[PDB]
């Protein structure tokens, strides 16, 4: 039971860090594909206010285009001369065109230069109303940004029971960035806080993989952390971590 297991967890774990990269590829085809579209542009390069009636033809146009990907949950469409069009499933949160123009993100995703820039649950500052939403953030054409939430947790809590509920549903999983941001906890109780509040000992955050038994909320258990090798610049420098009862492996 002893190198079995971290065996089986770096293969879980690595497996997990692919899929979370696959759906999140898949969100970068379709917003790909929603943004060549002839008509998403048009109004965009509207320089200048446009007619309630216009506005309203295009907010269906948004509606139709972003929000029938079964994840996609709001979408920001914006300029850097004062037009902001957004549309988004209920409850998701308004920004205004002030805390769009001057995000600290911006600069950072014009230096991706057309590439998108994810910001992982959390990690979006000017994004409180739902944290738990990821974020991907893209220049359009020098012209525009595209600011896209998505619902992902349905999505990666499958990927954690299919890649590593195989030995036991006791385990936990967490979505950890490099500065120990939980961002997700599968368990639903961690989320937002700092994993060096609940681990007893140094988790190895950056590793590719690296396990360690420790006390972690409040049970004994073999840690283990993933890092993905998603990280641009510092950037969605995010990491897989499970935490194992060590009864279940004793």
């Given at each position: 039971?002893?190198?079995?297991?971290?065996?089986?967890?770096?293969?879980?774990?690595?497996?997990?860090?692919?899929?979370?990269?696959?759906?999140?590829?898949?969100?970068?085809?379709?917003?790909?594909?929603?943004?060549?579209?002839?008509?998403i542009?048009?109004?965009?390069?509207?320089?200048?206010?446009?007619?309630?009636?216009?506005?309203?033809?295009?907010?269906?146009?948004?509606?139709?285009?972003?929000?029938?990907?079964?994840?996609?949950?709001?979408?920001?469409?914006?300029?850097?001369?004062?037009?902001?069009?957004?549309?988004?499933?209920?409850?998701?949160e308004?920004?205004?065109?002030?805390?769009?123009?001057?995000?600290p993100?911006?600069?950072?995703?014009?230096?991706?230069?057309?590439?998108?820039?994810?910001?992982?649950?959390?990690?979006?500052?000017?994004?409180?109303?739902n944290?738990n939403?990821?974020?991907?953030?893209?220049?359009?054409?020098?012209?525009?940004?595209?600011?896209?939430?998505?619902?992902?947790?349905?999505?990666?809590?499958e990927?954690?029971?299919?890649?590593?509920?195989?030995?036991?549903?006791?385990?936990?999983?967490?979505?950890?960035?490099?500065?120990?941001?939980?961002?997700?906890?599968?368990?639903?109780?961690?989320?937002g806080?700092?994993?060096?509040?609940?681990?007893?000992?140094?988790?190895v955050?950056?590793?590719?993989?690296?396990?360690?038994?420790?006390?972690?909320?409040?049970?004994?258990?073999?840690?283990?952390?993933?890092?993905?090798?998603?990280?641009?610049?510092?950037?969605?420098?995010?990491?897989?971590?499970?935490?194992?009862?060590?009864?279940?492996?004793?």
């Amino acid at each position: 039971i002893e190198q079995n297991y971290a065996e089986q967890s770096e293969f879980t774990l690595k497996a997990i860090g692919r899929n979370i990269n696959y759906v999140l590829k898949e969100a970068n085809h379709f917003s790909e594909s929603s943004m060549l579209r002839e008509d998403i542009q048009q109004t965009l390069s509207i320089n200048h206010e446009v007619d309630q009636v216009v506005l309203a033809e295009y907010n269906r146009l948004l509606q139709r285009t972003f929000l029938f990907y079964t994840p996609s949950y709001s979408v920001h469409l914006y300029n850097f001369t004062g037009q902001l069009y957004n549309q988004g499933k209920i409850g998701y949160e308004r920004f205004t065109y002030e805390s769009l123009y001057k995000s600290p993100q911006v600069s950072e995703v014009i230096k991706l230069n057309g590439k998108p820039l994810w910001l992982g649950p959390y990690e979006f500052t000017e994004s409180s109303a739902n944290p738990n939403l990821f974020t991907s953030i893209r220049m359009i054409n020098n012209m525009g940004i595209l600011l896209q939430q998505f619902q992902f947790n349905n999505e990666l809590n499958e990927i954690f029971n299919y890649f590593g509920t195989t030995h036991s549903k006791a385990v936990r999983f967490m979505l950890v960035n490099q500065e120990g941001l939980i961002m997700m906890d599968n368990k639903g109780k961690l989320s937002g806080r700092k994993l060096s509040d609940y681990a007893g000992s140094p988790v190895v955050l950056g590793a590719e993989y690296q396990s360690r038994k420790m006390t972690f909320d409040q049970v004994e258990s073999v840690v283990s952390v993933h890092h993905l090798a998603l990280d641009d610049f510092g950037k969605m420098n995010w990491n897989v971590v499970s935490v194992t009862p060590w009864e279940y492996l004793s």
